[PDB]
Every structure is written in structure tokens, then in C-alpha cells.
């Protein structure tokens, strides 16, 4: 599910 | 709004050879996600239609980047890391045909017109906003981005560069070559995973989950 | 000089499915080099030169008017021969996302903005006069003639559609689109006479001989 | 040497 772009994204 | 001026500061905020061009590719992914997140509207898409875009053009997006950061160069491309791949040495790695594709269609273009980087950012934000990008929840505001995005390039082409005309045109005619040379990139990197003989990182490595094309 | 009615007189004079497509195809072949003499200046270029040019672009030249043909056409495609194409059809042969794909990115935008065949006789002159084609004995002269092509739109298109200042853009931003589907309509086809289970004919044959890419 | 395409372009 495309774990490490989302976390990137979601941050600050 | 789409001001040239938050373009242009979201590309100067991220200012076997094979393998050293998977290592600052993999690299180059973590600072893409922050240029996008610079590029104006970017980050008021919903989350999933982020990672869409990002996804279907992290290779254009990052192959135009160092293109142009290249174009002093003579006969090669700078990688991110600091290292730089001549054509001889990719010619060496078996890479050789695609490697000239990028000088001869990308670098040595932006070279000929003095693309500046007000322009690459534009063009690269273009690219970001791809309404044909598969699963989009909302497509018609994604082409709404992307036609604020060339309405203020060729605004900022005619004020800059007012004697060429044709340069807003001459500069979107650089993004079918830059589709293929990315789609080819991306059937050498499934090859390189296939064959197992280069390392992959993480982020490089998420990037070939499903979906793909 | 590059006046748009030549390339619009151009237009209007050459005005298993899968099996049908590539007898389509392979019709439709022999009226593109009739179009392409039409186009100011093509039949001037050096012989060789035609054949690169001609051998480069055949396939987008035709995906653009075959999908320019069928704006009005709901879920499909005409073909030159007179056959309609359903998308269950091509869905039920296989080949339903690449068929998807020129529906959604080529057929539908085509219709949204009521692209006219002035527009459409120029980009395809665009795609015609490529200059990164491998081989030509002179790129800049190509480059010269899609310039011309290209400027004469722009101005085609600022008269006859002043109250939408971002058409000329949004016509030139089909073509990554184009080269994208251009080239996995190629593949395709290189895995039909791979397997042999489709008759190719002569001169969509001739288009599979070397060089290729 | 792609013969038919040849010959398409040299005609009247
Ligand atoms: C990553 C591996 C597959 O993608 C690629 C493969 C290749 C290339 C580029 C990419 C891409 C799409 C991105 C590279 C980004 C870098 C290196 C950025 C930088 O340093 O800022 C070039 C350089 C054209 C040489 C040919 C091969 C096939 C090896
Ligand atoms: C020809 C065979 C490989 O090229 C193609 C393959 C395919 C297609 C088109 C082409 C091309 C490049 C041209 C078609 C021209 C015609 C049909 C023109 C016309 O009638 O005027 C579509 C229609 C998108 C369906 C999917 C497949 C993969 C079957």
C-alpha cells in the first residue's frame, strides 16, 4: 500500500 | 494561483555506474516528496491522489532533474550523490543506447535553448500534475493545476524572453521525448530487479510495487 | 511559410478485432505517405529522410486520426475499413486497457475540446517532422518545419479561439499521451507476429523491420 | 531496406 510515500506525505 | 516564483523556489530548496544510479535515484525519491509538497496546491490534493501523482511521475520527474543539471557537463549526467557517469562509462555498463537518448533529446536541448530553472520547474510540475494519471479521485481538478501551471510558464516565457515566440511551445514539445526515455528507464529497472545483479533500495524498490503502467 | 489550410487540405483529402485493426492499419499505411506528401515542404526532404520520419511516427500518425475519426462515436473506435470496434470488443480480445486508454486520454479529450481537423492535421505535421528520429541527415531542418507547424497553430488557434488563451498548450499536452500509447500499441504488435496468430500484411510488415525504438 | 515504403515516396 505504498508504505514509505505515504508516511513522507503525511508528515509536515 | 500558480506563481512562477513558488515554482522556482521549490527547485532551488532541493539543489557499475547502474548501481550508482540506483543509489541517488532511491535517494532523489525522498526529495522529490518535499519539492512536491513546495509546489503550490500540491499538498491540498487528498492523500491518495498525492501518491498517485508521484508515483505515475517520479522517473520523468527525476530524469528532467538531472538533465538539467547536467547541461554544463560534456558527454555525461551529475547524479545527486555527487558522482558523474560519463557516456563511456554507461556504453560500459551496457546501458549506452538509452544514456545518448538523455543527452541528445534532454540535456543537450536544454543546453541549446538555456532552459532556466524557472522553466524546468514548470515543466517538471507539469508533469506532477498528470490528470491522466489512473485512480485520481477528482482528474478535472489535477488539469485544472496543470493548466494554471502552463498558463503562468508561457506568461513568464513572453515577459523573459519576449524575442522567441515559440520558446513556451519549444518547451512543452520536450515532454513526449521525456515520456519515452522515462518508460524505458522504468523497463531497465524492472530488468535490474529481475536479474537481481543491482541493488535496489527501498523507496526504488516501493516504487515497482503494483500498480504499474 | 507553413499555412494551415495546406495541412487541413492535407486532412480532407485522405478523409478477431484485432485482425481488423491491423488490416485497418496496414490500409490506412499506404493513404499516410499520400498525407504526409501533402504536408508544405515534407516532399522536399531528403528521401531517406521521409522514410526515418514516416517510419518513426507512423503509428501515433494513425492512433491521432483514427481517434479524431471517432469523437462521436460512443465506447469505440471507426476504422478506416468502416468497422466499428467496441470497447467489449476489444476487451473481449484482450486487449480492453490499451484500447481503454485511447478512449479515455485520446477520444474523450478530443470531444471535451471539439479539437477541429485544422488542429488535428497540425499536431499530427508535428509528430511528422520529429526531429529527435534517429538517423536524419539534417535534425535542425526537421526542427525547422515543426516549428513552422507549430506556429502557425498557435496563431490558427488564438483567432479562431480567442476566448480559450490555454488551447494551444492543451492541444500540444496530448502528445506525451500520444507517445505513450504509441508505443504500447508497437509492443503489441511485436508480440503478434511473435506468436503468429494474426495475419500482418505487407506494409505493416515492412514496418517491423529494422531499425526498431 | 524497406522496399515498399521506398517506393510510395520516390512516385508522383
Ligand atoms: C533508477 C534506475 C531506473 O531508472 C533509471 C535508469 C537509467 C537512467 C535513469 C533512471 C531514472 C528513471 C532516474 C535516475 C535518477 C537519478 C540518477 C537522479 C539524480 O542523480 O538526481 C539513466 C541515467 C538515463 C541511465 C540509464 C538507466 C537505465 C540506468
Ligand atoms: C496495427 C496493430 C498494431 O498497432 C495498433 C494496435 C492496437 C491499436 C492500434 C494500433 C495502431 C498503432 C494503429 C491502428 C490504426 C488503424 C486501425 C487505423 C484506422 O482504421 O484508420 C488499438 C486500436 C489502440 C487497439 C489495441 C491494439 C493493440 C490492437
Redesign the interface.
Same mark, same amino acid.
Given at each position: 500500500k505504498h508504505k514509505i510515500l505515504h508516511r513522507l506525505l503525511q508528515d509536515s | 494561483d500558480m506563481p512562477v516564483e513558488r515554482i522556482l523556489e521549490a527547485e532551488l530548496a532541493v539543489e557499475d555506474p547502474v548501481t550508482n544510479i540506483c543509489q541517488a535515484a532511491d535517494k532523489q525519491l525522498?526529495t522529490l516528496?518535499e519539492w512536491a509538497?513546495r509546489i503550490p496546491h500540491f499538498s491540498e490534493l487528498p492523500?491518495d491522489d &498525492?501518491?498517485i501523482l508521484?508515483?505515475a511521475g517520479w522517473n520523468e520527474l527525476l530524469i528532467a532533474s538531472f538533465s538539467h543539471r547536467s547541461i554544463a557537463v560534456k558527454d555525461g549526467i551529475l547524479l545527486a550523490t555527487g558522482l558523474h557517469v560519463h557516456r563511456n562509462s554507461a556504453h560500459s555498463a551496457g546501458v549506452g $543506447?538509452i544514456f545518448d537518448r538523455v543527452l541528445?533529446?534532454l540535456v543537450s536541448k536544454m543546453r541549446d535553448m538555456q532552459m532556466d530553472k524557472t522553466e524546468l520547474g514548470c515543466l517538471r510540475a507539469?508533469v506532477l500534475f498528470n490528470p491522466?494519471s489512473k485512480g485520481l479521485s477528482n482528474p478535472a481538478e489535477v488539469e485544472a493545476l496543470?493548466?494554471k501551471v502552463? $498558463?503562468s510558464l508561457?506568461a513568464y516565457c513572453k515577459h523573459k524572453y519576449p524575442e522567441q515566440?515559440?520558446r513556451? $511551445?519549444?518547451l512543452?514539445?520536450r515532454?513526449?521525448?521525456?515520456?519515452?526515455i522515462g518508460?524505458?528507464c522504468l523497463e531497465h529497472l524492472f530488468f535490474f530487479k529481475l536479474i537481481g545483479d543491482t541493488p535496489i533500495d527501498?523507496?526504488l524498490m516501493?516504487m515497482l510495487?503494483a500498480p504499474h &503502467?
Open positions: - | 525522498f516528496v509538497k492523500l &498525492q501518491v508521484l508515483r $543506447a541528445t533529446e507539469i491522466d496543470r493548466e502552463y $498558463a508561457e515566440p515559440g513556451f $511551445a519549444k512543452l514539445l515532454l513526449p521525448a521525456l515520456r519515452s518508460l524505458k527501498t523507496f516501493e510495487e &503502467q
